[PDB]
């Protein structure tokens, strides 16, 4: 069975997506596999906010539930619904996509096409959280208004920046075209490169091209040209105007405050 | 520094003022304040086209550049010069306005009473693009024409149908402000829904002028909801159609004409 989509971010409706597949599979007695189409077409519009992940960083989420394969994009928008299903379904009963799933040349493509052709289509009600369909789109639009304390609820988790490389670290999150946090200073959770779990304030800022700087607290090691993931975990303060220290020493103040807190929470 | 002006659109003109506006601030060490007056006056005058936007709207877009504040047409088309600066300009050394700028009784106001009361005023020139003086008016006129492709080279960006939602077709209420109507017709949109997702719809404009819209690979309620839509381009004119079934026959192939489309502008992009 395959379940096909392009699962940017693997949020709670797209696990939903993916534990459907796995039944299924289990019924069917047939293996399981999942095609992910490496971009959305929406991607390649100027509007585009970005992806919330890079497509290794979703693979590598994809693959925790079944063989992982990536549908590139280039190589399958031209293609006509029976070329998608001769080169990418010869021999599949059975594929699992999300509501008003499209596929081929103008989308040309659908459930029902694909039914003609003798293979049965699961389609997949999309999950509601708050009055609200989970999905890329309202998760990456949270990510550019850093509503980041609002993510989990439709994300299963806290949105992540990830990437390599007071002073502050200056995290390279790739060529990828990924979603960009409101310009601004951030409360994060540091993962290190050794299991090591400390927390950070995280600057958002220009100079076009977004970038993202993490003081972490408690360490004091050389990061270089390590990667680094980081758990957004809320939205202190918009982005300011040298009287810079003193902001950007309260802004500590403010993260042991808030992490004291976590803390007491016993 | 203060900018002053209707502002309808905030095309690249209007953005050309404002930005200046920013560019004294920052150089003045100053902060900026932004008039926009409620109404041109064409606005009461015969045969006005409409606005391309609300108040609403239009504050909103002018709010990112700097704090805002609606001057009512009413409430000052009556004042005097004098009055005009006596009441909204104290304190102000430097004014920021497009061309043919005017303000009180019988626009007796301009940039020279305003540089004559040691308020420094600059007039930025009209933007021109393509050979024409980027305006409000111009625009309007493209909508107008439902020449939708042309707008976003005056605009900045594509026209917005904006509204409450009043096979299935979304029924936009555009407010009870007189906003610019589109030439009756179909169109190829963006449209923006309130989670903050972006689908692709196929809007006919009909005949007041009456927007509808069919969202693709959409499913779902939208009663009361707020939906923005980027008109994109003019697909066909408006058609009679004496028999039901030549309707559908039609409406089938602007959904598939609107895949098409929206599979050239993918691919457009290599
Ligand atoms: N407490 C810390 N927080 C973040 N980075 C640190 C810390 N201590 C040392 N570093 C390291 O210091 C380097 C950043 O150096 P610096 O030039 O001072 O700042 P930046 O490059 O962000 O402008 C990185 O290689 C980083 O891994
Ligand atoms: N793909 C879609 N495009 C437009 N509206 C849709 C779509 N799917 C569901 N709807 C919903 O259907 C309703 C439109 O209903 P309907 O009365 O049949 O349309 P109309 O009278 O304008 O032809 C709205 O509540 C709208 O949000």
């Given at each position: 069975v395959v379940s096909i989509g392009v699962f940017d971010g693997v949020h709670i409706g797209h696990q939903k997506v993916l534990r459907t597949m796995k039944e299924i599979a289990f019924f069917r007695k047939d293996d399981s596999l999942i095609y992910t189409?490496?971009?959305?077409?929406?991607?390649?519009?100027?509007?585009?906010?970005?992806?919330?992940?890079t497509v290794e960083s979703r693979v590598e989420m994809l693959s925790r539930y079944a063989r992982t394969v990536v549908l590139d994009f280039f190589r399958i928008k031209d293609l006509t619904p029976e070329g998608f299903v001769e080169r990418?379904?010869?021999?599949?009963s059975a594929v699992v996509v999300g509501r008003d799933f499209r596929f081929g040349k103008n989308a040309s493509g659908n459930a029902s096409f694909l039914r003609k052709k003798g293979v049965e289509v699961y389609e997949i009600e999309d999950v509601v959280v708050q009055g609200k369909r989970v999905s890329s789109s309202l998760i990456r639009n949270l990510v550019q208004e850093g509503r980041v304390e609002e993510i989990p609820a439709y994300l299963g988790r806290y949105f992540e920046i990830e990437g390599i490389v007071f002073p502050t670290a200056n995290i390279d999150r790739g060529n990828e075209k990924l979603v960009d946090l409101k310009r601004g200073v951030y409360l994060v959770r540091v993962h290190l490169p050794d299991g090591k779990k400390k927390f950070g304030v995280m600057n958002v800022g220009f100079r076009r091209n977004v970038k993202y700087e993490v003081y972490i607290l408690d360490f004091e090691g050389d990061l270089y040209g390590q990667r680094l993931k980081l758990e957004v975990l809320k939205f202190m303060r918009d982005e300011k105007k040298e009287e810079l220290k003193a902001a950007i020493d309260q802004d500590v103040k403010s993260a042991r405050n808030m992490i004291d807190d976590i803390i007491n929470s016993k």
């Amino acid at each position: 069975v395959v379940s096909i989509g392009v699962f940017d971010g693997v949020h709670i409706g797209h696990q939903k997506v993916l534990r459907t597949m796995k039944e299924i599979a289990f019924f069917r007695k047939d293996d399981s596999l999942i095609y992910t189409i490496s971009y959305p077409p929406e991607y390649f519009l100027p509007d585009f906010p970005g992806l919330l992940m890079t497509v290794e960083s979703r693979v590598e989420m994809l693959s925790r539930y079944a063989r992982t394969v990536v549908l590139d994009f280039f190589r399958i928008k031209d293609l006509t619904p029976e070329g998608f299903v001769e080169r990418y379904l010869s021999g599949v009963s059975a594929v699992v996509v999300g509501r008003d799933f499209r596929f081929g040349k103008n989308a040309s493509g659908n459930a029902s096409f694909l039914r003609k052709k003798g293979v049965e289509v699961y389609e997949i009600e999309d999950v509601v959280v708050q009055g609200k369909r989970v999905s890329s789109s309202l998760i990456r639009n949270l990510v550019q208004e850093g509503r980041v304390e609002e993510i989990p609820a439709y994300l299963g988790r806290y949105f992540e920046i990830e990437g390599i490389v007071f002073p502050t670290a200056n995290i390279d999150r790739g060529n990828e075209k990924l979603v960009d946090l409101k310009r601004g200073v951030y409360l994060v959770r540091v993962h290190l490169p050794d299991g090591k779990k400390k927390f950070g304030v995280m600057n958002v800022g220009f100079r076009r091209n977004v970038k993202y700087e993490v003081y972490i607290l408690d360490f004091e090691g050389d990061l270089y040209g390590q990667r680094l993931k980081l758990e957004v975990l809320k939205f202190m303060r918009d982005e300011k105007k040298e009287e810079l220290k003193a902001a950007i020493d309260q802004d500590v103040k403010s993260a042991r405050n808030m992490i004291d807190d976590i803390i007491n929470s016993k």
